[PDB]
Design a binder for this molecule. Structure first.
Ligand SMILES: O=C(Nc1nccc2[nH]c(-c3c(Cl)cccc3Cl)nc12)C1CC1
Length: 286
């Protein structure tokens, strides 16, 4: 599919993606305002050869993924300004779970349905042989109060092999990362399950920033540490220390969370394992 830049009417900026920014447009070929509202992802113009090869990878990943709990790719556009392409996605107006949950009081049942949907989308992603590497509430879009979709794929990679070797990066979401990613710089399919546990914790805390993984971990570690945040994080996780049980979170749900956080990656449930578990848990509390 292809969109004409000539009919893209900028409305506002949505935020920052990994290789550039996300912007809201009205694609209006008839010029009457009835046009579809689209979310467009662009390559930041001053990007080097490294950020450009990474952007082409994300484009390719996004134009092949089709799942009901994964953001719908619409097509592309020629970005004459950055001499590349602009990724046209469906606009999800209610936004991210990180933005939505602290402003709307969502019940336990719905939060579990969201977790179930994240798993459905993630089991599909793993079957397509890709790892997400950035599974967080921030990257989960709410289509409606009963429908959630994985919305960002900036750090997503193809697994040829059960793990991918990651680079020592400063933009890595370390507070959502398994010990083997921090220690060995290896990202397994199971590493994505650790992140789901963290995403699940964020939902049961309603994305309250005072209860957030960075706030919680940086209270435990402290900030007197000189270039030793990741080391202390790896160390506290080895000691078996974890983020606490969110208020009013069911006991067995916290057990599932703690199981997604097994130090040994092999002892963590797959995304396929979690789908029947979460369907049952959602039914029990609905
Ligand atoms: O931005 C909105 N919806 C969105 N619709 C469609 C696509 C969207 N991509 C994002 C988004 C942004 Cl900007 C930054 C980090 C992670 C993500 Cl996932 N948000 C998207 C809502 C709030 C207006």
């Amino acid at each position: 599919t292809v969109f004409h830049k000539r009919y893209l009417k900028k409305i506002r900026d949505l935020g920052e993606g990994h290789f550039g920014k996300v912007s809201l447009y009205c694609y209006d070929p008839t010029n009457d305002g009835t046009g579809e509202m689209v979310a467009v992802k662009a390559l930041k113009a001053d990007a080097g050869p490294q950020h450009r090869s990474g952007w082409k990878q994300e484009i390719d990943i996004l134009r092949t993924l089709y799942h009901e709990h994964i953001i719908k790719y619409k097509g592309c556009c020629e970005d004459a300004g950055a001499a590349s392409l602009q990724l046209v996605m469906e606009y999800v107006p209610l936004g991210s779970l990180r933005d939505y949950l602290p402003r709307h009081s969502i019940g336990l049942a719905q939060l579990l349905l969201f977790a179930q949907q994240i798993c459905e989308g993630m089991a599909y992603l793993h079957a397509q042989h890709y790892i997400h590497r950035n599974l967080a509430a921030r990257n989960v879009l709410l289509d409606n109060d009963r429908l959630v979709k994985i919305g960002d794929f900036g750090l997503a990679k193809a697994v040829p092999h059960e793990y991918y070797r990651v680079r020592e990066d400063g933009d890595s979401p370390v507070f959502w990362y398994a010990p083997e990613c921090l220690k060995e710089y290896k990202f397994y399919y199971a590493s994505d399950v650790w992140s789901f546990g963290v995403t699940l914790y964020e939902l049961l805390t309603h994305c309250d920033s005072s209860q957030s993984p960075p706030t919680k971990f940086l209270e435990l570690i402290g900030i007197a540490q000189g270039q030793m945040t990741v080391l202390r994080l790896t160390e506290l996780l080895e000691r078996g220390e974890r983020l606490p049980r969110p208020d009013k979170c069911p006991a067995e749900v916290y057990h599932l969370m703690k199981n997604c956080w097994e130090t040994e990656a092999s002892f963590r449930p797959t995304f396929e394992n979690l789908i029947p578990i979460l369907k049952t848990v959602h039914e029990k509390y609905r």
